[PDB]
DNA sequence: ATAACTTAGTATAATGTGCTATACTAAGTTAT
DNA sequence: ATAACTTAGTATAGCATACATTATACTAAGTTAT
DNA sequence: ATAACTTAGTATAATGTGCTATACTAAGTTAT
DNA sequence: ATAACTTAGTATAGCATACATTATACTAAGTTAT
């Protein structure tokens, strides 16, 4: 216990060992689970796997996704490990409730959803129109897109960028070094080149905006109504607004979106990595090429964003 | 403890659900055979004795079961062990060491591995031919469903599961069937399959000598009785048994007799024909992006496997030596 | 010490679980290490770590090659580890005294030696010459050497070969069926495609030797003085044999070797390996295409059994 | 046991030699600093412990150090427990959880890895034209220098190394150098380096006014004193300093006063002349059979990083955006 | 008044051998 | 009686879910320079 | 008598982060 | 006195040896069908 609590505390002292977004989960996971143990009764750590079980299955009933149930799973049994105690996993009643809560929920359908592809006709299209335009959000917006396709970069590391990470190949492409990812953390790092047209955009954006001023400003910053940038070199554009660019961005295409309510009606964050993988494979482009352009360093997810008759061919005489 | 024991086979069965009915089946099997040869030979079944499961895996070497087997049943007693909270046979080394062993003594004896008696164009060619003409009510369901087999490349398991109204035309005055083939959560919902004016149209003929889907819970194909008659089904699958038999009754139609020894593949199975899609794809010219598409197939370890005698896939040897 | 016992007990009762090389050297090293003890007056097993190191620094001064000091004090680590007790090399005297070795014998020079390589000239020159001889040693000698470079299997592989492994492309090409290696072990196995020009070379050996009479005869089999072969089922041609084929191929073409005595002199079991390995690259094949063709699974043994100006080139106009 | 540890110093000390010098000054480098920080802090520097790495690794952090140094730091006291018996700092969840921390807080501000200042033609053709004309004996023979470090691409601890008969003209009426660039047992011997009618006649010059192996013990550089005199020696090695100055004090002739900030390569140095080969070997067209031999870089990583910001590394997207 | 964010919380995707399917033997089940 | 299946049990061949994070997607409400 | 092995033993190759080098600052060493 | 080095200490960038086998290489002596 004593030696429980300073697991605990050695955790939240080097809290930074981990992404904001992991002490954010973990956080909220824990809000659920205390409230769900509290309303009945039980002790909310260190977790009873006969509770955790019940808790599993009760986020099933609630119509969760199973990649949510596992998130709430995996902060608990984050939490337990790192605390020095043996996971809710470690257990059989909670080992096999989380698989059999994956194989009932597959065999009844749910499927991991992924975002609707941003593709190269997408991005002409979207630049044909906007092109035109000299509102300062309307350059941004297509500057960010570009850059977006092009170098596939997750709407995070975009927002990262600093004036000062922008270089340049001798034949005039841009080029921007990338410090941190979602699957890297290094004083490496990887440098993405922007094509000449893409370059084009992005200089126009610079020019307008004023971002440039202090080489430590995050390229992309905020426009006011009134169409004045609002460059800063402490605050980053939110992922939040950059993805708002993609739905903003399809809502000028296709109008507003179904009533449904279902996730990925409209573009978002993800939808140019996946459609420029996608506009990659169908090019021809090396699995090995297509990876080093999306920077994964394994070979399914590249693979899955994608799939779709060749095979009648033969026959078909 | 036998009460920490006892809580974990407790656990197993309230979530059961947990693995395949196959799983299950394969379970009890290994299980109902650990027990008998213990029991034959005075052993205790559970907990499972590293020197007994060793002696175990020992008998059925000599038994002449293949090593993925022998591996099917030290698999199988570890799942029931690990699951049980006593310790894995295969963390013992007894057991360990004699797998090691029986591994490497089998093939240095010959322990070949069997693929699948191919089912390529010069076979649908073949039975196409003879059947074609045939008014049997049976010939024109089986020729269309070794019709799709070809062009398809589906499962056995996944051919049966079709349903009728996975048809349309649209393809344009042709067939497209629609289908679903994972299980996964990042992976798929469902497919669209297209056939020449064969696999289509032989089709036509059952759609119009089966029933149709008159009730499209129907699945599309169904029993044909000794009277030549079908029973259109809207809710019960065409046995497993009775798809792959249609690849075996065929295969006697052919060669008759099935092919004597006491071995596996003497005819053709379930599989003859994705192999036969796969080798004959490989002759074409095919991009793996366009073989592994056609079969499903997640790997390219399988379907190498399968062109592995072809021409076409000699070597770099063999071709600087023929420069 | 009981436990000790028993675990050796063990050991020795899965020997089958090792390769028969393993049990040699194992005995080897157990030898040559129990007679240093002995001479020395100090106790073989369980071995003290001060002795080890001293009995490394011995072969060391003997003159043995850096590789076979570390199959010393590999084969008694493992019969350390695999009686439960500590292995030498878990102690600080030995751990450092190898790296020690390692350092001072190459830092003097030492290099492990690779094969000489036996590549399509060489096998053109051997083929033009043997070609014509209706001898049935000959002929035998001239469908190994094409086999071993065709297929690049090493000599141990070779002399399993059993008649009833060979099957036929469609387009007449010889097929080859493997099963276990030294770096795989299956049911499974690959499949060794020969040239037709190969397989016409097989085939004449099959025609004159007989062996084909029983397809579970070993496809490489002896020829006696009077020409006359002598398949078996159950005896293969010992890689002694295998090795005195290239031997004697290189005498035949530069005569006999140096009176240095050293290794390498002349081809040798494994020259084919290397040396086709080396012709691929030289072809451009891809080095996924050599690792294929010679069914290594890495890419440093590949790698390696090349090497050799270009970066003159431009300097050079 | 202080015995048990004082063993295993005495263990260290007597095979001391199986570690490079390099080693043992960056080990005991680490340990005077840690020993500081220690005494100054008031904690026991041996056996170091968890909270006292930790706090120490914070101010390395806080030093304004790399990533890499701090880790080389932990490495070191890792290295000195490992090798004494005592556990590894870093296998402390403390120690553990800092590092992690710090290597994420560090490229969050903009840690930026250095590369070098590239010695490319532009540059040899430039200082060639410079002194090519100078009877200077120092810039007759940092042209041959800087003229091989180009054309070869050899290391700096391995152009000093350089003796005098690793020369013939065998090329033809033309140099060759012979060398040794290993240190494995698989690895290698030597190689055979050429020159253009630059790196090996600037060479000449040398040759003509050095002195040249009168005894082969002579390496092929040497110092050349105030006097513009030089120092022929068979025996000693003209040191790092020098030959990594050569590229220092090149670069001072032509843009002079080195470079203010107080920033790392603001100059050229040691590696300047590879990463210049290799990102000229490859605006020519060059195969990586031949970029990786050139430079005798075992990897394809390292080599990648200098041509980074190349047209012709620029990849997939652009030049599909650029049909 | 607002455009155009930002902040914040919950939901869900994405990434750096052991389980499940088929093959084959046989015995059971229905309806002709 | 059997054809034509189904079910069953075991051999054997082919597949991919569980770890430990770290990030995106979406809804909602708050914020600030016009 | 032998060719052409085979057997047998020792020697050595081959295969399915942590160590070592450079960079840079400075202070020391010799000979002009 | 300084130019031209060398040595030293520490920062930082690039490399590859240690595990656990399993096999080949070489020397030597034994074996058997002519």
């Known amino acids: 216990s004593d030696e429980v609590r300073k697991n605990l505390m050695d955790?939240?002292?080097?809290?930074?060992?981990?992404?904001?977004?992991?002490?954010?989960?973990?956080?909220?996971?824990?809000?659920?689970?205390?409230?769900?143990?509290?309303?009945?009764?039980?002790?909310?750590?260190?977790?009873?796997?006969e509770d955790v079980r019940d808790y599993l299955l009760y986020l099933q009933a609630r119509?969760?996704?199973?990649?949510?149930?596992?998130?709430?799973?995996?902060?608990?049994?984050?939490?337990?490990?790192?605390?020095?105690?043996?996971?809710?996993?470690?257990?059989?009643?909670?080992?096999?409730?989380?698989?059999?809560?994956?194989?009932?929920?597959?065999?009844?359908?749910?499927?991991?959803?992924?975002?609707?592809?941003?593709?190269?006709?997408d991005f002409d299209q979207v630049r044909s129109l906007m092109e035109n335009s000299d509102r300062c959000q309307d350059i941004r917006n297509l500057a960010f897109l570009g850059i977006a396709y092009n170098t596939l970069l997750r709407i995070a590391e975009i927002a990262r960028i600093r004036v000062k990470d922008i270089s340049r190949t001798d034949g005039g492409r841009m080029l921007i070094h990338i410090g941190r990812t979602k699957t890297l953390v290094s004083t490496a790092g990887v440098?993405?080149?922007?094509?000449?047209?893409?370059?084009?955009?992005?200089?126009?954006?610079?020019?307008?905006?004023?971002?440039?001023?202090?080489?430590?400003?995050?390229?992309?910053?905020?426009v006011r109504k009134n169409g004045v940038a609002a460059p800063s070199a402490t605050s980053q554009l939110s992922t939040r607004a950059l993805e708002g660019i993609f739905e903003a961005t399809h809502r000028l295409i296709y109008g507003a979106k179904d009533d449904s309510g279902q996730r990925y009606l409209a573009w978002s964050g993800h939808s140019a990595r996946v459609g420029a993988a996608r506009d990659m494979a169908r090019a021809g482009v090396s699995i090995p090429e297509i990876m080093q352009a999306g920077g994964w360093t394994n070979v399914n997810i590249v693979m899955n964003y994608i799939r779709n008759g060749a095979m009648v061919r033969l026959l078909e005489d």
Chains 1, 3 share one sequence.
Request: charged fraction near 25%.
């Open 11 to 49: 955790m939240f002292r080097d809290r930074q060992a981990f992404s904001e977004h992991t002490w954010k989960m973990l956080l909220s996971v824990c809000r659920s689970w205390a409230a769900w143990c509290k309303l009945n009764n039980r002790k909310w750590f260190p977790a009873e796997p």
């Open 63 to 121: 119509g969760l996704a199973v990649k949510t149930i596992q998130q709430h799973l995996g902060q608990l049994n984050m939490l337990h490990r790192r605390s020095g105690l043996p996971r809710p996993s470690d257990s059989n009643a909670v080992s096999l409730v989380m698989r059999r809560i994956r194989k009932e929920n597959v065999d009844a359908g749910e499927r991991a959803k992924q975002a609707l592809a941003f593709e190269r006709t």
């Open 191 to 222: 440098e993405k080149a922007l094509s000449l047209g893409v370059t084009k955009l992005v200089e126009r954006w610079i020019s307008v905006s004023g971002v440039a001023d202090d080489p430590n400003n995050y390229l992309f910053c905020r």
